[PDB]
Design a protein that fits this description.
This is part of a larger assembly, with five copies of chain A.
Chain A (H helix, E strand, L loop, with lengths): L1 E8 L21 E6 L2 E9 L20 E3 L6 E5 L3 E8 L9 E4 L9 E3 L4 E3 L2 E2 L8 E2 L4 E6 L3 E6 L8
Parallel strand pairs in A: 10-13
Antiparallel strand pairs in A: 2-3, 3-5, 4-5, 6-7, 7-9, 8-9, 11-12, 12-13
PDB class: viral protein
Keywords: SARS-CoV-2, coronavirus, Kappa variant, B.1.617.1 lineage
Entry title: SARS-CoV-2 Kappa variant spike protein in complex wth ACE2, state C1
Chain lengths: 165, 282, 99, 50, 148
């Protein structure tokens, strides 16, 4: 019987021989938790026009946070965009008036979700009106909401007052 | 092995000044259009380095302490630099490292080496048929107990001699951190008379050796030729320096390369730049 | 291996205390009693398990531990081992092996 | 007003890389090395400093 | 009546991504046992394997081994462990002599030929060579040390 005896000895010298790898499929333009070599994090992988130095695998911003990474296998420049996040704003009239409620998102378009978009973010549960009236509920980007007329919540541009020549 | 060169003449270690030399990429982190500050072993700007040379009546292959790290700069024509000898006792009593270039591959091994008083490589019979082929090996008599071996990719090195200005420049950085040898390399042509030229260059990573041994001393391998104590050396100059834990301001351009470096301690002016973390002092 | 945060063949298989456990652990040497001849089979333990057992849980499943792809069919064999095992007890055992 | 705000924001962010006495500034690193009872000791230092 | 922020929404990761380099530039472990001739029990060669990646799943799932056993380390855990130095021993011994290979063993081949220290963390592999080494008339090329 031919016998092959493998002697495993761990000395003070650095380690080299290691087990196999995985290298699963890659996904882009989605929120996912990615682990590249000894780096981990959560963000959106998007290919940008930046060019990393051949000897520099990982990049960093002024905050020491990596905004992009290079595929350990294939050669590509992938920008790391954090997943969508923001504050939850609830615009509703007082309990005495009505129970109607309008949800508002900040710094993000409509994703999760009368779904309308504004400069401040996604606004659901409201109606867009072209007629500008006096501000009622402050929102942002020069936009105010109010409860009016079979009445609901509408979103109109904040008026600066009547015109006088 | 125990024979010493007859033509070799002893000379005092003359010193020269370096301008920006000793700057290198600290890590693999990519950065652009930003100014980063980091501390590591560096060669201070406007510092004093050592002046060595090799020629057919003075030849320099002295021993020098490695300490934490050192900086090497040499102007070459025939690529007279054959490698370096790294070891604690520089004998078979311990494990010594040899980085050598045979003109084909880069041989890097860690074994128990037999140390020669004056190691080198001779080359005979140039004349016609320019030759330039290694023949005798004085680096080590024998080797055993090898815990490491490495060989680079095949390449063709031109050892033919040249005249006029030196056409080759090799500046390397050797250091040991957590038992990891770091080698940074840069090669660019220059027009030089003596000392060092005024300019900036950023060294790049070459190889990474996880050997994990202590090196208290080192030597600089050189190539000798004659048409083994009677060999002669060609005209060449190489330099050595000591690295210190100094903080530099590395200015990154839009492409990611370092435009210029600023030593936090030079004069009262530079200290103001690291205080403001900017190169513009109002 | 019995204590909050501790791991081992006990905490990871049969008996595990939670990390926030508040209590008192008492122990004494019964070797002069529990030890009978060559061993006492009244006290057994789970040697092998496919995952880590949570604290405050008792799993009596005797299912054969299968480390391979070959079906064990409830019997020992290649990559098939019987997880429940007995503590060897003897009066001559060392302090480490005494009950 | 713009510079004072930029320094406050830049400062606030760069503090995340500080150890604050902890072994490392990364949370998953401490959780992936020390035991549950040992990690909480280090994680508290980060939470306290941050 | 007014606008109130009751919380801060955050998008959770849908799935986890994994990426690494290739498996290329390995050590030819298959050629170690595939070698035509092996050294004698006294002549056993010691091969030093380092600076590569090792895949042990092919050797275990190939069913080309007669007996496979490890000491101190499980076969499934080898893939997740990095080792600095790996020495692969090669030699030929009798069938009944394979049982003497292990930490703290005895016998002729163990004491007078090859022995395993009590702390040996490696593994053992054997397969029947009767279809190669053994030939008509007998093969005396493989010897052993009987007395010491």
């Amino acid at each position: 019987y031919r016998v092959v005896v493998l002697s495993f000895e761990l000395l003070h010298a650095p380690a080299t021989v290691c087990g196999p790898k995985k290298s699963t499929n890659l996904v882009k333009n989605k929120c996912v938790n990615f682990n590249f070599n000894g780096l981990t994090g959560t963000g959106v992988l998007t290919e940008s026009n930046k060019k990393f130095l051949p000897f520099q695998q990982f990049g960093r911003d002024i905050a020491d946070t990596t905004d992009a990474v290079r595929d350990p296998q294939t050669l590509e420049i992938l920008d790391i965009t954090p997943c969508s996040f923001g504050g939850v704003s609830v615009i509703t009239p007082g309990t005495n008036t009505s129970n109607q409620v309008a949800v508002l998102y900040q710094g993000v378009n409509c994703t999760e979700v009368n779904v309308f978009q504004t400069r401040a973010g996604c606004l659901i549960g409201a109606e867009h009106v072209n007629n500008s009236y006096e501000c009622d509920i402050p929102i942002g980007a020069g936009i105010c909401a109010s409860y009016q007329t079979s009445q609901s919540i509408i979103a109109y541009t904040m008026s600066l007052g009547a015109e006088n020549s | 092995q125990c024979v010493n060169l007859t033509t070799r003449t002893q000379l005092p270690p003359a010193y020269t000044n370096s301008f920006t030399r000793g700057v290198y990429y600290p890590d693999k982190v990519f950065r652009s259009s930003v100014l980063h500050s980091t501390q590591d072993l560096f060669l201070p700007f406007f510092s004093n380095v050592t002046w060595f040379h090799a020629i057919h009546k003075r030849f320099d292959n002295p021993v020098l302490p490695f300490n934490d790290g050192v900086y090497f700069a040499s102007t070459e024509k025939s690529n007279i630099i054959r490698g370096w000898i790294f070891g604690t006792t520089l004998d078979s009593k311990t494990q010594s490292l040899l980085i050598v270039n045979n003109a084909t591959n880069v041989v890097i091994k860690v074994c128990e080496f037999q140390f020669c008083n004056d190691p080198f490589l001779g080359v005979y019979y140039h004349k016609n048929n320019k030759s330039w082929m290694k023949s005798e090996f004085r680096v080590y008599s024998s080797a055993n107990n090898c815990t490491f071996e490495y060989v680079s990719q095949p390449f063709l090195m031109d050892l033919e001699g040249k005249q006029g200005n030196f056409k080759n420049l090799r500046e390397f950085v050797f250091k040991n951190i957590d038992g990891y040898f770091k080698i940074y390399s840069k090669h660019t042509p220059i027009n030089l008379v003596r000392d060092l030229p005024q300019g900036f260059s950023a060294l790049e990573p070459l190889v990474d050796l996880p050997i994990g041994i202590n090196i208290t001393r080192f030597q600089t391998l050189l190539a000798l030729h004659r048409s083994s104590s009677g060999w002669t050396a060609g005209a060449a100059a190489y330099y050595v320096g000591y690295l210190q834990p100094r903080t530099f301001l590395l200015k990154y351009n839009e492409n990611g390369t370092i435009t210029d470096a600023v030593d936090c301690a030079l004069d009262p002016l530079s200290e103001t730049k690291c205080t403001l973390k900017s190169f513009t002092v109002e | 291996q019995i204590a909050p945060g501790q791991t081992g063949k006990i905490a990871d298989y049969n008996y595990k205390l939670p990390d926030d456990f508040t209590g008192c652990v008492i122990a004494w040497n019964s070797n002069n009693l529990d030890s009978k001849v060559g061993g006492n089979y009244n006290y057994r333990y789970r040697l092998f398990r496919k995952s880590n057992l949570k604290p405050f849980e008792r799993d009596i499943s005797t299912e054969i531990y299968q480390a391979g792809s070959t079906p064990c069919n409830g019997v020992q064999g290649f990559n098939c081992y019987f997880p429940l095992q007995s503590y060897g007890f003897q009066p001559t055992n060392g302090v480490g092996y005494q009950p | 007003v713009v510079n004072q705000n930029a320094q406050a924001l830049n400062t606030l962010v760069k503090q995340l890389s500080s150890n604050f006495g902890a072994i490392s500034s990364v949370l998953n690193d401490i959780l992936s090395r020390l035991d549950p009872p040992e990690a909480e000791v280090q994680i508290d230092r980060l939470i306290t400093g941050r | 009546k007014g606008i109130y922020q009751t919380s801060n929404f955050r998008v959770q990761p849908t799935e986890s991504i994994v990426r690494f380099p290739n498996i290329t530039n390995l050590c030819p472990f298959g050629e170690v046992f595939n070698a035509t001739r092996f050294a004698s029990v006294y002549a056993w060669n010691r091969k030093r394997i380092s600076n590569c990646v090792a895949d042990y799943s092919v050797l275990y799932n190939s069913a080309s081994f007669s007996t496979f056993k490890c000491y101190g380390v499980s076969p499934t855990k080898l893939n997740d462990l990095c080792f600095t130095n790996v020495y692969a021993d090669s030699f030929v011994i009798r069938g009944d002599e394979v049982r003497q290979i292990a930490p703290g063993q005895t016998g002729k081949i163990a004491d007078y030929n090859y022995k395993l220290p009590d702390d040996f963390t490696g593994c053992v592999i054997a397969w029947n060579s009767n279809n190669l080494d053994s030939k008509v008339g007998g093969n005396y090329n493989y010897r052993y040390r009987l007395f010491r």
